[PDB]
Each structure stands twice: as C-alpha cells, then as structure tokens.
Subunit: 230 residues, 3 copies
C-alpha cells in the first residue's frame, strides 16, 4: 500500500494472529481452574492486539493531528489496544504471586493513568504540552515498576519455588521491555520527530510482539500456572 510502514503493520497482524491461534489450541482441554485463568488472560491479549493491528493496516486506526505547523499521522489505535492489554499483563503477574486486592487496584489504576495521559499527549495540538503529558505518563509508569520490585518480588520469594522463578523471569522481561516505550515515543513521530514513522513502526512492532507473545510463551510453558496437585 502507499504508506511505507505497511509492511511492519502487516507482519504485526500476522504474528498476533498466529500467537492467538497457538495459545487457543494449547489451552484446549486444560481443566485446572488456576491454569484456566492464566490461559484466559493470556490468550485474550494477542486476540485484542490482532484486531487493532489490522485496523492500523487498513487505515481505520490512523488520524492526522496538527502540531508544529504540519499535519502529523498519529496511530490512535495503539492506545485503544494498550488500554485493555496492559492491565491483563499485570494481572498475569499479580495472580502469579497472589497479590492482595489493594495492590492489584493500585497497579491497574496507575496503568490506566499511564495510557490515558499518553493518549492526551498524542492528540495534543500545542507542541510543548505534549511533553508535559509524556512526563505525567512516565511518572505513573515508574510507580508501576517500583511496585513490581518492592512489593511483589518480596512475596513471590515466600511462595512455591516454581512461582518465584517464573515471576522473576517475567518481571525482568516486563521491566526491560516497558522501559523502552517512553523513549521511542519521545524521539519518534509523536515527539521530537528524530526517528521517522516507518522505523518507529518497526521498533514498536518488535516490542509489541515480544511483550505479548514472547511473555506468553514463557508463562504458559511454566508449571507455575497450575495449582499444586497430586
């Protein structure tokens, strides 16, 4: 098609589709009520992403935003996907370590503020204000990262060894890949505009696939997702 980033949108669509199908077939027959929750959560994540990658591929998920005296292409469908997928991914982690309800609310609520302030920043027509929104969004993210190291890492250790080991890996995956998101937004098409749109779209595609399908491959092969049973 006529937008150079199309190839990375097509490839993202295909990878999320294949991931959904694999997790769906792999979850068939699972009867353990605990693993059923982890399959439910983890298969819904790439199914949502599939539909929203497709909407960007087909042009629905794209709008033009005037700032810096120019009509800027903004993919708003990213924030519609992230709004529902990112709390499910934190739910996978919190259920692993059997977090208490107060802590789950805090994580999901902070996650909503991070995504919502990011959408306002993406659509903001006053250039300098877009970075104010980027700052508030990044602060909400640092709160989440703090919780994952100084609330969760200290209960998982008092848990089943298989739980503690699977959580450590997935926590480390989460902190590394989530930290790259604020930087790519800042230097790409929504921010300073140093990196062009087609390269920004490739970077996000590599990040989006790793943090959902990669994460899922690690979790759903683990023994931690089953109750202990004879």
């Amino acid at each position: 098609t006529g937008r150079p980033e199309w190839i990375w949108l097509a490839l993202g669509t295909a990878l999320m589709g294949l991931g959904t199908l694999y997790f769906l077939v792999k979850g068939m027959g699972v009867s353990d009520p605990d693993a059923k929750k982890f399959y439910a959560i983890t298969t819904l994540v790439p199914a949502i992403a599939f539909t929203m990658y497709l909407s960007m591929l087909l042009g629905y998920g794209l709008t033009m935003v005037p700032f810096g005296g120019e009509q800027n292409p903004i993919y708003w469908a990213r924030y519609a996907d992230w709004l529902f997928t990112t709390p499910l991914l934190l739910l996978d982690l919190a259920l692993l370590v059997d977090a208490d309800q107060g802590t789950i609310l805090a994580l999901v609520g902070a996650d909503g503020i991070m995504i919502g302030t990011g959408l306002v920043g993406a659509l903001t027509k006053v250039y300098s204000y877009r970075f104010v929104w980027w700052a508030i969004s990044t602060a909400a993210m640092l709160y989440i990262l703090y919780v994952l190291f100084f609330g969760f890492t200290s209960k998982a250790e008092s848990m089943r060894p298989e739980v503690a080991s699977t959580f450590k890996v997935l926590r480390n995956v989460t902190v590394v890949l989530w930290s790259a998101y604020p930087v790519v937004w800042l230097i790409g098409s929504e921010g300073a505009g140093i990196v062009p749109l087609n390269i920004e779209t490739l970077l996000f595609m590599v990040l989006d696939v790793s943090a959902k399908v990669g994460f899922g491959l690690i979790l759903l092969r683990s023994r931690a997702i089953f109750g202990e049973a004879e």
Copy 2:
C-alpha cells in the same frame, strides 16, 4: 417525526422503560444475597437500553457514514448499549452454573471483541472492509456459543435440578436470538442494503426486547436465583 423508523424507536423506548420499572418493583424487599445479584444484573440491563433507545429516538445516537458513494445513516448508539448489556446477560448465565473465573473472563473478553469489531465495521468507510470486520465479529461470537454448549451445559447438569432446567431454557433462548443478529446486520443498512432501514429497525426492536425483557421474565420468576434454604 421525519424518520420512518421513529415508531419502532418510540415503542422500543417504552417497552424498555416498562420492563425496568417492573423488575425494579419486583425486586423490592428481596433479601437473599444470591437473588439480589440476579436482580441487580437483570434490572440494570433494560435501564441502560432505555437510555440508549431514547438517544436514537431523539437523534443523538445517529451519525452519517460515507460509503458506496452515499451518506449512510448509522445508529452508533446500539454499540454503546450492547457494550455494557451483553456481558451482563452472560454474567446471569455464568453465575447460574457457578462458572469458574477463567471461563467468565473468556466469555466477557470475547464479547468485547465481538462488539468492538462490530463498531469498527459499522463506521468503516471502505465498503469491502466492513465485511472483514463482520467476519471477525462473527468468529468471536461462535466462540461464545461454543462455550455455552461445551463448557456450561456440562456443569449445570451436575447442579441443582432447578438450576439445570432454568439454564437450559435461557441458554437456548440466548443461542437462537443472538444468531439472528449477524444476519440482520449483513442484509440491512450497515451491510448489503437489501432490507431498508425502517424494517431493519423493527427487526432489531423485536430482537432487543425479547433478549432482555423476555429473558428477564424467565429468569426472575425461577427458583434458581435463590440459594437453597429452609
């Protein structure tokens, strides 16, 4: 008013209003914590629908969408109602059979994908793509229907006989009436345009009232909604 479908919107509004009022008066005094949940869920459903039928009657819930080189009337308020009412109706069924949490998440999440992809298809400006969205939405629906027969029908039987009998009736009601929705959309104003808007609006009105107020009349007269008590 000046749109021929107004009479079916007015009648839908009145029927949802009367239904809400009846379920509200009937639920007064109920103290059983179990029946309270079924009344809560089941009365919220026609109250939401009342407000959204009214917005279509008054013109707020209507927009024009250009496709096939024509300005097409699209009632978007349908998807704002269905987004909150359809998961409540599946919650009535899952609580009946005491479904496990993993299965409820799967049903509600699949329901969200079905409604969300339906809204994208309703607003899509490229004619042939509207049917791609219709196909993904229908696939999410088939997943839901499968769950209701090959996950739920097999636990309800291991339950109280009054539960098993009320669920069978409501499951059958659900599968028959929900299957008509994809067909009416395809042949009506959002799709191929064979059936005109005023007749499509009548068909949906008959389907919307039956699946909410009819469903509710069956459930709230049943003994299944109470715990077993002496």
Copy 3:
C-alpha cells in the same frame, strides 16, 4: 490565560496534586490488607482528577456545543473524570459496611447511568432535550441516595462501632455534597445559563475538592480502615 475561569482551574489542579502526594506518602508502609484497599481506592481518586483538571487548564478538555443559537463552551473532561472517580468513592463506602455484591453492582451501575446521561445532556444540540437528560440523570442519583440510607445505614449499625460512626459521617458528607451537583448544572452554562461560566467553575472546584480530598482526609485518619487485630 484568556479564559477568566483559568484561576479556579489552576487552583483545582494544585489542590488535587497536593492531595494525591499527601495520601501517597501517608500510605507508605501500611501492611494491613484492608487498609491497603482503602488507600489504593482513595489515592487513585485525586490522581485521576489532577490529570483531568490539568486538561481543562490547558484547553484540551474543552469543546464548543451549538445550542440556543450560540457556540457554548462545554468542559467535557469533567465527565471523563467523574466516570472513573465517582464509583471508587462509592466503593470506599460499600467496603466500609461490607455490602453484598448485588448491592455494589446496583450502585456502580446506577452511577454509570447518572454520568453517561449527564454527558449526553451536556453535548445535546436541542436545548429543550438537554433537560430531559438532566431529569433521567437526577433520577438515577435519587436511587443511589436511597440505597445509601435504606440499605447501608442499616447494616453499618450491626457492625463495629468505629465502622458505624465513620460511615455515618461520610454518608452525610456524600449526600449533601452530591445533591448540589444537579442544581449547579441546571442554572449554569450547561443549562439555563443564569450563573456565568467563571462562577460555575469556582462552585464546582469547591465541590470537587471537598468531596475527594476532604472525604479522603476523614476516611484515612479513621480506625475503621484496619481490620480488628491485637
């Protein structure tokens, strides 16, 4: 800036920010799983409000709506904030008295109808219809107020005395301050237009800060938020 109401938006922003920071520092170290829920809920409330007051300050949260043959400034960001903060505030109360699930659903669902019909009324382009939406919204509110006196006040009394006393105060705070909202909307810029926008913005600022940060100061100093323990 060039809108006279800016000073009340700036002051609201600052007060919600300071409130968030105070509740955040005060909740540090709390380990009781019960108080953790009350801190989680109660700190998220002024953090959401901070971001949405800021969006009104910076102009993002403002739109123009044509009615009465005039282009009317409508702050739509109010309803985006109230949509997520008002159910959390009712969750604080229901958890205090350990409400049953059916009753919480009813309150949160009625709250959604009240806010949603209020947004439709704020954006409605036919003047006389805006008050129809105001009436349906006010009816949903009266339902909520009824529940708080003739469902909750009668279980809190059968509870811990510290719970019963803290709930009475917060219930009374809630009923008084929430009842002022329908009146200010009716006589201000969204309704009859008797009170001008800058004064309406001051009134709401005083109401918004009292009902969130004031409410929170009362609740989080109470002993009711902790389980009974030795």
